[PDB]
Symmetry: C3
Subunit: 149 residues, 3 copies
Amino acid sequence: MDFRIGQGYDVHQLVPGRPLIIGGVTIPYERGLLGHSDADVLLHAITDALFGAAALGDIGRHFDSRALLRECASRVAQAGFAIRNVDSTIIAQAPKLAPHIDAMRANIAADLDLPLDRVNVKAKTNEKLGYLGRGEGIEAQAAALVVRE
Amino acid sequence: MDFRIGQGYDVHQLVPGRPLIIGGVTIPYERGLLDADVLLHAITDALFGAAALGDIGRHFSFKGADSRALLRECASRVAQAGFAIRNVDSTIIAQAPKLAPHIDAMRANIAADLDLPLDRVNVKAKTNEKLGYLGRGEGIEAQAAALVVR
Amino acid sequence: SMDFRIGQGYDVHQLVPGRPLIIGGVTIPYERGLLGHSDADVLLHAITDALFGAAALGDIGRHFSDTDPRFKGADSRALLRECASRVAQAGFAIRNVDSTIIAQAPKLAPHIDAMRANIAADLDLPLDRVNVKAKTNEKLGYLGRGEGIEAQAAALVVRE
Ligand SMILES: Nc1ccn([C@@H]2O[C@H](COP(=O)(O)OP(=O)(O)OP(=O)(O)O)[C@@H](O)[C@H]2O)c(=O)n1
Ligand SMILES: Nc1ccn([C@@H]2O[C@H](COP(=O)(O)OP(=O)(O)O)[C@@H](O)[C@H]2O)c(=O)n1
Ligand SMILES: Nc1ccn([C@@H]2O[C@H](COP(=O)(O)OP(=O)(O)O)[C@@H](O)[C@H]2O)c(=O)n1
Ligand SMILES: [Zn+2]
Ligand SMILES: [Zn+2]
Ligand SMILES: [Zn+2]
């Protein structure tokens, strides 16, 4: 009965000499995301959306990115919540992400102890507009539903 | 009950020589989007998201299908997976033109296409305060959220 | 009862000299503040839009139009409270609110709990059903240059 929603946002810069790691999947690319972790922009957005839904603050109040997402899952359960579903969008002009998506999903499902059909990941270009459109960064948006058991 | 949430995003460049079609409604304007219906794309993505069926690109690579047909085909696929739609909410970010006059039309299109009571569909509008490409009239963005139940 | 609905909201405002910085109803010590017709509380407007959105009552402009002079310098908390009242009058109880503020500066952490408390008070909710998150934009874009602050919101309600 006690449903809650959460929403998450992250962005990271694309820089030289860094691997591109999105949703736990390493992707061949001439740049990668800049950050104090592996800078996995998708997993940060989902992490914030889960903390948001459980009213536990945000990632920076709490903290590689899969370990952090697993810890997030732990704290959400610690607070009395179970995760019903996650959905997300990755905004990246390049590279193409569609062939890596089911893998990201599998990664996320494992990390949150959820079946595949409750996790979703989607991708969009930014039509060459703004910093996203010139490939200067990548954005992720997330939504999460939990229930307080 | 087994509720699920989905979220959607889209953006399109704003240029002359195309008509402005948002939420299935053609809007008097000197420019249009490169139908490129940013609102219906966002919502479609939100619905596939809630059902966990990937995204609009994965379903529709439909050669001469407008975004309303795509939206209708989206809804049918969501139904087939066991999910009934509960509501949709959305925001259009457009520095111009004025969209308020067109909102009831957009909601009527969407509610028709999703087979929903009008009071379960909402569309909102915002400017970008002259900031960025949106605030300079170089593009328009849509955001959407959908709740479904299986 | 099980008639749940979701809403989402978005707002942005320019950051300029000579205005008070008010986010989540908290006045933040800062050499700049948000520009708008009301007090420009970007976070509260985003949450307000999300609530109207969940209830299918249109948007903040429909209810409290910037073409109306009475909302000049309007207290966005009073606006949030009227929004919640109209949402309740449409038949909805609010279950939770989540949100994100994106700003290069100032540091918002020391003010976040107070924002959450204001919102909880205005929505007549306990603290554990309201969340506020803060993000930098990693130095990217007009947000990264400090030209504005953006807020995003999500709300879940139930028709009683
Ligand atoms: N393309 C647009 C832009 C906005 N609006 C209407 O104008 C209202 C106000 O838009 P906006 O100026 O972006 O809102 P705020 O900036 O939050 O207002 P304020 O400055 O008072 O905070 C919206 O809610 C909407 O009803 C519209 O119909 N079409
Ligand atoms: N203007 C801001 C922005 C973020 N923050 C805090 O900083 C943390 C996140 O910062 P960030 O966006 O740099 O996170 P990363 O993307 O670097 O992981 C959160 O805990 C926020 O509450 C803040 O206090 N003030
Ligand atoms: N980096 C990306 C971007 C998009 N895509 C796919 O491409 C589709 C269309 O994206 P787009 O940005 O061209 O969207 P529209 O131009 O159709 O609005 C998405 O729905 C995804 O399926 C991808 O696989 N990888
Ligand atoms: Zn991050
Ligand atoms: Zn599109
Ligand atoms: Zn505002």
